[PDB]
Amino acid sequence: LPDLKIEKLEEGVFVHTSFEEVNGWGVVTKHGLVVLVNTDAYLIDTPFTATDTEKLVNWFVERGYEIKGTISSHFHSDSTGGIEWLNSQSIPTYASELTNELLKKSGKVQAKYSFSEVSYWLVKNKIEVFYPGPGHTQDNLVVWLPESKILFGGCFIKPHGLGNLGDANLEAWPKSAKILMSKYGKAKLVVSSHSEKGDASLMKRTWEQALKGLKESK
Ligand code: NA
Ligand SMILES: [Zn+2]
Ligand SMILES: [Zn+2]
């Protein structure tokens, strides 16, 4: 398995890439973000493991940042795998009510703090959380960095195919993608969990893949 990667996109924004073997898929590549506000660092999704989460935290703490918070974009272990370790270090973990419910229902450790706001500031004017509706999962949400015009679309953005459909809502995904396109068309950069970073068109590609996946199912 390749090592954890940490790449600077620009001032105060880093992409973390972690790797895991998943039954039926082989080696899954997973992207998340670390966002800096002054000397405060926020994790957008945890790596797959406690081990990679610790390495990621140490990399930023060693450079003089303090980890103020982590948010999980949905309940699957590629977003939530580090939550138990973060909870053991009293680093605050956040997830939607629905995500914390789906973590419980599936016998996994919950984020410490749950929210039900559809759209709100994680950090005022720096980090926005938005739920476009069901798609990849019932709970999937996105994170918006207004100052850098970067959207983190998580496992919702699927420009090359929908991946794992087990927890997906094919009926809703196309409407959810249209809602995301109307809200975040001014995006310079879209970071997805499982494909290369791209421009705002990745949201259209996802809509197209969602319509096709719906048609192929019915
Ligand atoms: Na700080
Ligand atoms: Zn997922
Ligand atoms: Zn995923």
Numbering used by the authors: 4 to 221
Task: Give the exact sentences the study uses for this entry.
IMP-13, a member of subgroup 2, sharing 92.3% amino acid sequence similarity with IMP-2 and 82.5% with IMP-1, was first identified in the Gram-negative pathogen Pseudomonas aeruginosa from clinical samples in Italy and is a common cause of carbapenem resistance, often involved in large outbreaks. Imipenemases represent one of the major groups of class B1 metallo-β-lactamases found in Gram-negative pathogens, and these enzymes can hydrolyze all bicyclic β-lactam antibiotics. The overall protein architecture of the IMP-13 apo structure is consistent with that of the previously published metallo-β-lactamase fold, consisting of a global αβ/βα topology with a shallow active-site cleft at the border of the two β-sheets. The structural information and dynamics presented here reveal important information about the mechanism of antibiotic binding, as well as a significant role for the active-site-covering loop (L1), indicating that the plasticity of the active-site region is important for the broad substrate recognition spectrum of these enzymes.
In the apoclosed structure, the loop is folded over the active site, while in the apoopen structure, L1 is extended away from the protein, leaving the active site accessible. We define the open conformation to be the loop pointing away from the protein toward the solvent and the closed conformation to be the loop positioned over the active site and pointing toward its rim. The distance between C-α atoms of Trp28 for the open and closed conformations is 8.8 Å. A comparison of the carbapenem-bound complex structures with apoclosed elicits very few distinct differences, with the L1 loop seen to be packed over the antibiotic binding pocket. The distinct conformations observed in the two apo crystal structures and the NMR relaxation data indicate that the L1 loop is likely flexible in solution. The lower root mean squared fluctuations (RMSFs) for heavy atoms of L1 residues in the simulated doripenem-, ertapenem-, and meropenem-bound complex structures than for those of the apoclosed structure indicate that L1 is more rigid in the closed conformation when these ligands are bound, while in the apo protein, L1 can move with a higher degree of freedom.
